[PDB]
Amino acid sequence: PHSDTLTIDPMITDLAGETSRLRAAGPLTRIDLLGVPALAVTGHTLARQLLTDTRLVKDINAWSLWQSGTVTRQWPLIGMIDVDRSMATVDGPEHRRLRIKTTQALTRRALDALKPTIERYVAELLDDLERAGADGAVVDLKSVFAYPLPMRVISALMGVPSEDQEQLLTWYKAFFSILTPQDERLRVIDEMHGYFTEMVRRKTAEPGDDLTSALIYATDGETPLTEEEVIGNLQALVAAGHEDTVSLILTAVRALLSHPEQLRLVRDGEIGWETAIAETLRWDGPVIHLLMRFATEDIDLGDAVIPRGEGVVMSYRAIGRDITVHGADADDFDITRATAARHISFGHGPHICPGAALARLEAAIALPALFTRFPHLHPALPLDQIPNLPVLTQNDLSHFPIHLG
Amino acid sequence: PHSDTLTIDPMITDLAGETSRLRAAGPLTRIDLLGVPALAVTGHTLARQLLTDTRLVKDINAWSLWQSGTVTRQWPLIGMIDVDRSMATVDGPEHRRLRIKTTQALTRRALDALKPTIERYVAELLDDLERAGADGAVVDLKSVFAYPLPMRVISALMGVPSEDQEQLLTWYKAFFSILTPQDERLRVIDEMHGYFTEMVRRKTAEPGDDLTSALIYATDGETPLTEEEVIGNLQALVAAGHEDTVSLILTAVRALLSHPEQLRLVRDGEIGWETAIAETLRWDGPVIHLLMRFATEDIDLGDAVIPRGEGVVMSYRAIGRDITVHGADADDFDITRATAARHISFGHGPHICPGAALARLEAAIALPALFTRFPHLHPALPLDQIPNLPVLTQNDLSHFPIHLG
Amino acid sequence: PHSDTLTIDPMITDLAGETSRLRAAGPLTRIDLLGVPALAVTGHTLARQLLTDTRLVKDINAWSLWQSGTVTRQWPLIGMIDVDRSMATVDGPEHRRLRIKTTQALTRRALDALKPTIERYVAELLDDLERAGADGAVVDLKSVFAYPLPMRVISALMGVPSEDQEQLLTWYKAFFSILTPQDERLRVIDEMHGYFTEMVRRKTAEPGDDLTSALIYATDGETPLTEEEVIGNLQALVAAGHEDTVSLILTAVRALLSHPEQLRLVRDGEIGWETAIAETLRWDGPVIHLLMRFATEDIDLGDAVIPRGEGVVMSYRAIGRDITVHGADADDFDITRATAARHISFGHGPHICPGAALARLEAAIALPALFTRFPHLHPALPLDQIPNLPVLTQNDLSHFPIHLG
Amino acid sequence: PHSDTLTIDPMITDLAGETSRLRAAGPLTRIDLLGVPALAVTGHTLARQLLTDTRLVKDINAWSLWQSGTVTRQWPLIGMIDVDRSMATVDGPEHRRLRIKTTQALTRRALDALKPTIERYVAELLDDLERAGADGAVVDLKSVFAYPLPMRVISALMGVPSEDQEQLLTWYKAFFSILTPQDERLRVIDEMHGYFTEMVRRKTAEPGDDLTSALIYATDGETPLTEEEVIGNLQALVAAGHEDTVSLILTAVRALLSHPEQLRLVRDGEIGWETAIAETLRWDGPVIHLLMRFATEDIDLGDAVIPRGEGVVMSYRAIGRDITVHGADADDFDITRATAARHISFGHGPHICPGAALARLEAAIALPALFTRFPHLHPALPLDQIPNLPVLTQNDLSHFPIHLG
Ligand code: HEM
Ligand code: HEM
Ligand code: HEM
Ligand code: HEM
Ligand SMILES: C[C@]12CC[C@H]3[C@@H](CCC4=CC(=O)CC[C@@]43C)[C@@H]1CC[C@@H]2O
Ligand SMILES: C[C@]12CC[C@H]3[C@@H](CCC4=CC(=O)CC[C@@]43C)[C@@H]1CC[C@@H]2O
Ligand SMILES: C[C@]12CC[C@H]3[C@@H](CCC4=CC(=O)CC[C@@]43C)[C@@H]1CC[C@@H]2O
Ligand SMILES: C[C@]12CC[C@H]3[C@@H](CCC4=CC(=O)CC[C@@]43C)[C@@H]1CC[C@@H]2O
Ligand SMILES: [Cl-]
Ligand SMILES: [Cl-]
Ligand SMILES: [Cl-]
Ligand SMILES: [Cl-]
Ligand SMILES: [K+]
Numbered sequence A, B, C, D: 001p002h003s004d005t006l007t008i009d010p011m012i013t014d015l016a017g018e019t020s021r022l023r024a025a026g027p028l029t030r031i032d033l034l035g036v037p038a039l040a041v042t043g044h045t046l047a048r049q050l051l052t053d054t055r056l057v058k059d060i061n062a063w064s065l066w067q068s069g070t071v072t073r074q075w076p077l078i079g080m081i082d083v084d085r086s087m088a089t090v091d092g093p094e095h096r097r098l099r100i101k102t103t104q105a106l107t108r109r110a111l112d113a114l115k116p117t118i119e120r121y122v123a124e125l126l127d128d129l130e131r132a133g134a135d136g137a138v139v140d141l142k143s144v145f146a147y148p149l150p151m152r153v154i155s156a157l158m159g160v161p162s163e164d165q166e167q168l169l170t171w172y173k174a175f176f177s178i179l180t181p182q183d184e185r186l187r188v189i190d191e192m193h194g195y196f197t198e199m200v201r202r203k204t205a206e207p208g209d210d211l212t213s214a215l216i217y218a219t220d221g222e223t224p225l226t227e228e229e230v231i232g233n234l235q236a237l238v239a240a241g242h243e244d245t246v247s248l249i250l251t252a253v254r255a256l257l258s259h260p261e262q263l264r265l266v267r268d269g270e271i272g273w274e275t276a277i278a279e280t281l282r283w284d285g286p287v288i289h290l291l292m293r294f295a296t297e298d299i300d301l302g303d304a305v306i307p308r309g310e311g312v313v314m315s316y317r318a319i320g321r322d323i324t325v326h327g328a329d330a331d332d333f334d335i336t337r338a339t340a341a342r343h344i345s346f347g348h349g350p351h352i353c354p355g356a357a358l359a360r361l362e363a364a365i366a367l368p369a370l371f372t373r374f375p376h377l378h379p380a381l382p383l384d385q386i387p388n389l390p391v392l393t394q395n396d397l398s399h400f401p402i403h404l405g
């Protein structure tokens, strides 16, 4: 049945159907997010244009529905938007000051110092896979390998103690799940804020060799970051650094296992692993929808107008399936396509993902290490039967049962 | 493709297909349980006969595969069989001594003293549903209502402190999941044993108004139960009292919601709630397979012989679908059928479930309370899309998204 | 994807799906009629109760959406509600005065005088079928037989000249089609009003042996009907007398042709033709939705409240599929079922169809005459491929290709 | 079930299946046209050869079935063949005289004088779409835009008065529909002949600036056309000029809406509109079968022989799907294919469509005007559910429900 507003299903029962419908109704279309209306950008070229348009800001105070009190903290998606001041909420000249220390710490050269730590965690978790898969038993690749690894890496970078990481994982699972009761979710949001507040206090009194300390003590240059800004950057870096990288690792393994000819190309050195990672990001990336941007004034696109105060969502999954950019086979996984590295699954413009080099590095180490260690790894359950968790905006897989072979 | 040994799929990908194949290949057929062979009893009349045959015992030491060292603690299903001495592991005259105090405490008349406690827990968890479902939000009926309720009831009966119940739930989820690494599963089994050992120590020093204390301090009649026997009975009562009752509540709601005409019959008083519960137990009961029985000698059934030392599994789900007993519509949910209360989903013979009256009482209170409180309750996800957890022998649903209406 | 408001599709793409969804969400549920909200009564028992509830009136001025100017004449369904004063728009004591002369003229005994006229028209149109079907050609059963017949009968009863009937058919097709541009639809509504206004003028100056003349000149008893009341009754009698009877004839033929065993039962005298007509009315009747009733005050039904001013639609098709009344096979056509004549497809309460005896008489003459004349009549197109016309509230078939045989 | 004669289904229930079966059974195969046998040419190269073969003539008197009286005016397709003398019925030297005045009037340079008239009608009917689609209402693109436009254009060219065009539309709908009773169809054929006879009389007494007058008064050169020849040319020009162009406009919109990437290419100027029109003509053109040609003697094709007197049909739709000419993707709509302008959907040889430049001009004006005016135009009904009218030889769509957006 036809409707002009596409309701994003919170259970993610038909992700493929929604992504195709969003593309067909694009590049700009109305969507419904749990009773709240917004515009969705589903086209590649229009996304690049709007992601650099200074009239679209992240600040929730620019949202006419927030101004009128129509949307409140009872909205189950409010934790994705109504967050503390950070690089994720600011635009304009002040944005660069909130990003500079993080981008400096996340350059390829800076990450070379972190590479041996990543190698150690990959090796340790491969040992866990080996023990778990003994005697031909079925193993959850997510819980044993892909789920803990990015948390370990981002915790080492930021300075999160090893004993605290299980609690963070429990919090994020409740934070992202649509099934979490809203009173519990807001409570989890408060508990996470309290944890990172105390972590910043702990690093202020006793700084260490970690990014959090660098945010706290920026040394020469610029106004010091406020407590809210340090906590906000910390919160965004851990959340994204963990959530998105877990998805990239799992979807890459799923794509390569279901395309064994292409897995052979990367294992034999005919196609680079980073090219396989790029096509995974384009075809099956971590972000489904990015909430949210708001128009500070009317934005005229010629045929259509984005009214002042309207909310605008970047539908990165639909954007990756753009037929105008990638061709008629955009819905297929093909690491040999020429437009693989043309994706914008890390974003575009000022808010482009600062951890993109780290995400690429983690996947580029973990993936060949996994398939070299277990060359006969294969699913114990048909890959197409692996369901998504009920997470509206993130491409989160539930579990990944495999046999080591 | 045809095969003579039916492999029970650990991912529960096709439960309907397996149940029909087990019925078609029955009433006695060979099955494969994660590489271990056994016979499956899938016929109603043959089950009743074998459940009273004194030549089939629960003791794992009668298993020829256990005697020969072929099956070890590395088998992922070993926690269902190699357990402490209890009413679940003994046969013959000593069996009655390990059951008498429990059956005396679990009669319908004895349970009348527990009814107000059950009513309070149902009312409290319905309040949780109301808060979780505020503003039309989607609610997990399992996590908010059906999952905690039987744990609170069996904990009140046995004397498990309120603060310890979340840890028990965590243990049982790992105990039952096939995805749990076997070293972790064996550790959880050890941690559960340590908890219940200390609980018996705590109740020995300071007995209370609970069944555990009754097992510890009987009257002058009969030999006192050993420490192993008390712990063993306690472990079986909590595990079954929780695990099976959660499934009954969820499957009853699923069956009634997908058959609103039949839900109307029970709410309007034309069919009793206990009849709707009986048909749920027959059609979609908590136990899929019951492990395990072993022949002390050759058992001649006419057309076939069960060799001495062979393992025998009661496939209660397939048994409930017996067409010879229930008719050509055995695969349909119909609370008006005449053979509903003729099911043996609680077992038969000496090992018949001792908590059947409590399971019936919990469901008979919780179900009408749920539908009276939320008369417009309905699924937020198509009922047929609710998956089973990867638990081989138990009918465990993953989650139950609903709207209060 | 799940939604709490069921949008009635104007293209009638999935009538079966919508009818089942309306039943499943009933007996009272919210619907969307081309952007306008209303409640739909989809349950049999609740319909009978509300159709006799004096707090639900037909007068559009009781509609809060009409009072507030939210709904206007630009709404494509406004011609079904905002009509002239007649028996269709009034409730209470004045309702009986607007119905008495019509009900007196439409009793079974009064209709005996019209039977030879119906017989002549059936015979004439069967002759048309014979000529149209010459040399084995395909014939549109609708255009040649079922479409003109009820117009000729209701025109003979009301006094519509033979030469004017083709224009009336053209008007009604535009009136009912959702595809008609709204400015054109409003013009057709005005042209129909002008025609019937002049017809009443013509009958006032020169009365005849017809019902229209009877409405104009009653006896000394009671106040004479106003001009608006005569025109209004005339318009309702012609519209319903034509539109609904065409559908009944076509759906009866479709149901019997797709169930030749049941057609054999009526032709061989084991089941009466009026019973086959009753099951057609229950299973595939002319009315899909009846617009519209409005609550003069809050109506408490126990679990729900119909707010004052809300619009209430009788979904007669969904009501006919009531499983609580007709059993588990309610979606099947079965003239031997015991509940066939228990349908309320003619309505219930004061507004019950006054022409039901005439509709039954027309079908009871036409159907056996058709099958006696052409015993080998059969479809030239698969019956399930016959589409509905885009008419939201009426069960209107597009065309009915047959061969005479 | 296999048969050597392919029966063309008069209801067009499976047009895709028949077209593929005709191609698979080609390039020359037997078909059944409502009980009348003929040969069908379904291959591209064989069509070009036979369309220039002087042994295949249009004259029905060369048909052995017509000579023997086997086929008569009772055949429902006889109006496509047994027509008055015109350019459509003559072959050889006399053919050019019946075509010269028409081809001279239909050159691209001559049509430049008609372009402002086409622009005015497109603008007027776009205004009708705007009014019909007000307030988001569904609009029939056929009835409001595509159906009247070619009639207006061909009427302006030929000199048909504006007030007479609705009657012509009504006649042609009955003429083409297989559901029309044959006695009514022959009557419609007579009424059309009477209308065009009087139109030629009217233009003879008072000639105007139109093609009909040019046919009547050819000025210098050649024998004057007879009354039968003028009426015959007039009849063919209006019938084809209207019927085929309506189909081209609707199928082009359907193809572009279902391929939004390709619609973007033409709207952005990367592919010419005339290239999109060419691929629409190749893939989904107006003519399905062209009746009919007859062999004046035995025609030897090497492997097969067309016997003298046999009827030969050009299956232009199947011809457009020729895999030998267009490749393995011939069944796909792709305006970027290299063989798009290689189609013969306008025919080939002496009888090639004389109005091809006019059809291309009408579509090349109307299509960009439509999408420029309503850039967000989209279907209100799934495009694949738009059915064909029961017209055997013409690709006639029933209705085209859209929203303006
Ligand atoms: C694993 C693959 C990853 C993907 C596909 C991804 C993608 C994205 C996207 C789409 C955005 C928002 C762009 C927008 O505003 O529209 C973003 C922002 C961000 N990401 Fe990533 N990310 C990934 C991993 C990471 C990692 C490893 C980190 C490390 C901490 C990280 C930290 C951040 C932060 C802090 C922002 C906010 C930047 C800003 O708003 O200025 N992400 N990412
Ligand atoms: C909710 C529905 C329940 C079902 C369908 C069920 C079913 C069963 C079955 C099939 C057996 C084993 C029969 C055999 O040996 O083949 C069993 C045994 C047992 N059940 Fe239940 N059960 C339920 C709830 C409960 C409850 C509420 C308790 C309370 C503590 C309980 C405690 C036990 C114990 C201790 C045994 C072992 C008895 C023995 O081996 O002697 N179960 N049950
Ligand atoms: C062919 C089968 C027919 C069916 C299934 C049918 C059904 C109905 C229904 C459902 C209603 C409205 C009930 C309500 O208010 O909810 C109605 C009212 C009415 N019908 Fe019929 N009808 C049929 C034929 C006819 C015929 C032959 C006539 C003759 C004139 C007629 C004239 C009317 C009139 C005037 C009303 C308005 C009565 C009032 O509102 O008081 N209908 N009918
Ligand atoms: C809209 C797209 C059109 C298509 C695809 C089309 C196609 C055709 C075809 C296939 C034929 C017969 C070729 C044969 O004999 O096998 C034909 C003939 C003819 N068409 Fe068109 N036509 C179109 C539009 C028009 C228009 C706009 C006119 C203007 C009057 C027209 C007038 C004629 C006439 C008079 C003939 C007979 C020519 C002859 O037999 O010498 N057609 N057309
Ligand atoms: C959306 C995101 C996950 C959720 C993050 C978001 C950055 C801002 C942020 C700060 C919080 O306090 C909660 C999590 C969020 C909302 C991240 C940007 C890229 C990644 O996908
Ligand atoms: C199988 C069962 C769940 C697992 C229980 C079993 C009784 C014996 C038992 C004692 C333990 O220590 C672990 C759990 C088990 C193995 C129960 C009998 C009925 C219920 O379904
Ligand atoms: C709805 C109906 C068809 C449309 C009729 C309606 C009665 C009232 C009426 C008067 C009019 O002027 C237009 C048609 C309508 C709106 C009829 C009652 C039963 C039949 O189905
Ligand atoms: C077949 C046709 C439609 C019907 C036209 C035909 C040209 C000859 C002709 C003269 C008539 O009198 C009726 C219509 C017909 C039969 C046209 C040629 C191309 C177009 O498709
Ligand atoms: Cl990349
Ligand atoms: Cl029971
Ligand atoms: Cl009836
Ligand atoms: Cl072309
Ligand atoms: K666009």
Ligand SMILES: [K+]
Binding pocket: A332
């Ligand atoms: K593909």
Ligand SMILES: [K+]
Binding pocket: D026, D027
């Ligand atoms: K050939």
Ligand SMILES: [K+]
Binding pocket: D332
């Ligand atoms: K294809």
